[PDB]
């Protein structure tokens, strides 16, 4: 049984590993390969701020709430292990800041120690009048990618750096199942006009004194179009733009300014932070994650495609529940093929 | 008038600045000088883990509670300012871990968001069954010392390398008031057998991924004789020994081991941390802080000494309240001499 996962971003590798760990022991042969035209550090996952937190508003599909939860508990269960940091994983506490009262988020009980900020805490943030405190996890994408590829490699999964032109060519090259984990570029293999790039720019900074995440919201502005500060493993991420529809891969001057001034005002000590790097990523924005299976027909073998894309600005946050779901759909595929 | 502060640790410089800021404008001339035989980075303050947290048990003098509180609110009021990190100041959250239930600490309301740990949080710390979460402040001693000396220097206060042999010599050199901020060595200038060194050893480490403080307690072995982990401004402090009565200034292997294994078991990711330095400090341990006024006589001139030493393992935590108290006593000294504040 030959499985090609297309994509080496967080979604690809997580899904690839989950499939292998679930079925290596029961299927023989099972051959899993990863194709992609960029690997770390060249994916959007690499640019990700690296924090577990869903959108403040609930999701359309309630399965996603669950996929987030599964992802959190998965990640939390690693805290305590010697290799947590090598995976890019470590606990962080921080603040969500609003200019007025808002409902509690659907994920309040999933995180650790959710509570509302007290009048004292707020004086720390002059420009805001309401907010939350909680404890969550950093998942640094660059590092987690390095961990997964190593974990994949150790188990004999093989990587191929290449550009897939169609699902057809890959099936024709001998894939029985295709897991489509192509992020914002899924539309090149099958038009999907619900999928748009969520263009976010970030500034990477050396400011090791900052131990807490700080995320502001501007309800009249759209999610992550207000300043945010997220301590990483060895640097800090500064953001404040997330504009959907823009396909520009290059850094922009106006965005640099919006992020720097917004964050400098939020966290004035930034005046002495050294700028280390500036990047631009595309979140695969979609009303809903596409995680379903599809039957494609070329030549003689019917080939099965399982999509797993459109995780917007929360791919790190939801990834494991999504992989888990794909490996189950895959199980069904094995079934119908009397393969167990 | 002429004021000599003896000591350039956190207590000396704090007290010096507070006195200057309160009385520069009302006394003329006011001449404040600092004498010490070590400055940053060679004081015990420099070796301090750098975290705001009093002892878990209540203090003998309840005033120290207030002094801790004042210190916290003072420091908190700077969060939001551009210069917070330059002062060595930044917020941190973390965990206090116990093997069994304990009373809430007297300072629970002073910190931010004190609460008890939940069963899930405890899963992160296999060896422990009860604890707290809260948010507090880092005050890195090395950095704060640098800030204070700069702030002192800008206001014309002058620093002198000098080992003081007696209070007499300094008075005879023309000091009207002496502020005694000599830490654990105060006994050299006036015996005080209540003062003992609290020898603590620490390992400084590069483990930037660790954002939270983690302090374990062993109620039977005494305070800070159980592993503790404190993220600093650009490195992490690892500890687990605090033995009173030992005057050994050299690092020892047994303590290095107690700290490394204890902390590696607490925080297993430390396996990849690079060791960047190892130190040994002496906390000026005392049943309580000596902060009182004393009149000394040498040849019919009255010299006024105000002591401010014996802050044990909490000098950073309590310093500002203690400085504030010294300024008050100094104000009283002025009153008695018919001099007028405000
Ligand atoms: C600035 C920014 C900050 C973010 N911060 C966070 C955060 O803090 N927390 C969080 O949870 N999420 C965050 N996100 C969202 C998260 O980064 C994304 O949802 C996630 O990285 C998308 O992962 P992916 O694997 O689906 O796509 P990608 O990471 O882009 O990977 C896609 C892969 O598909 C491959 N590919 C595509 N088409 C082809 C083809 N035809 N042939 C071969 N290979 C192909 C690419 O080479 C690539 O390897 C952020 C996003 C941005 C832009
Ligand atoms: C390992 C360790 C970790 C600690 N961690 C923390 C923590 O996280 N938080 C906290 O609040 N506290 C902590 N402490 C306690 C804290 O370090 C002390 O309470 C504080 O540093 C004492 O400050 P000080 O200025 O009185 O003494 P010091 O910092 O020792 O300064 C003493 C000064 O007096 C001078 N001096 C003495 N005698 C003479 C003389 N005859 N002539 C001239 N100069 C003289 C010295 O040269 C020096 O300048 C820790 C202590 C240790 C050992
Ligand atoms: C753009 C910018 C930042 C993000 C992060 C912030 C915290 C979780 N998602 C997503 C998208
Ligand atoms: C010895 C060792 C450590 C300490 C610190 C740990 C946190 C606050 N006091 C004091 C004394």
From Swiss-Prot, chain A:
Cofactor(s) the record lists: FAD
GO biological process, any: dopamine biosynthetic process
pH dependency: Optimum pH is around 9-10.
GO molecular function: D-amino-acid oxidase activity; FAD binding; glycine oxidase activity
PTM per Swiss-Prot/TrEMBL: Phosphorylated in the cerebellum; probably not by PRKACA, PRKCA or PRKCE.
Cellular compartment(s): Peroxisome matrix; Cytoplasm, Cytosol; Presynaptic active zone; Secreted
Tissue: Expressed in the liver and in the kidney, including in epithelial cells. Not expressed in the lung.
E.C. no: 1.4.3.3
Gene3D superfamilies, per the entry: D-Amino Acid Oxidase, subunit A, domain 2, NAD(P)-binding Rossmann-like Domain
Stretches the record annotates as Active site lid that may open upon substrate/product migration in and out of the active site and close to increase the hydrophobicity of the active site, to make the hydride transfer reaction more efficient: 216-228
CC per GO annotation: cell projection; cytoplasm; cytosol; extracellular region; peroxisomal matrix; peroxisome; presynaptic active zone
Sites where the protein binds D-proline: 228, 283, 313
Entries under InterPro entries matching the protein: D-amino_acid_oxidase_CS, DAO, FAD-dep_OxRdtase
Biological function: Catalyzes the oxidative deamination of D-amino acids with broad substrate specificity. Required to catabolize D-amino acids synthesized endogenously, of gastrointestinal bacterial origin or obtained from the diet, and to use these as nutrients. Regulates the level of D-amino acid neurotransmitters in the brain, such as D-serine, a co-agonist of N-methyl D-aspartate (NMDA) receptors, and may modulate synaptic transmission. Catalyzes the first step of the racemization of D-DOPA to L-DOPA, for possible use in an alternative dopamine biosynthesis pathway.
Name the UniProt record assigns to this protein: D-amino-acid oxidase
The species this protein was found in: Sus scrofa
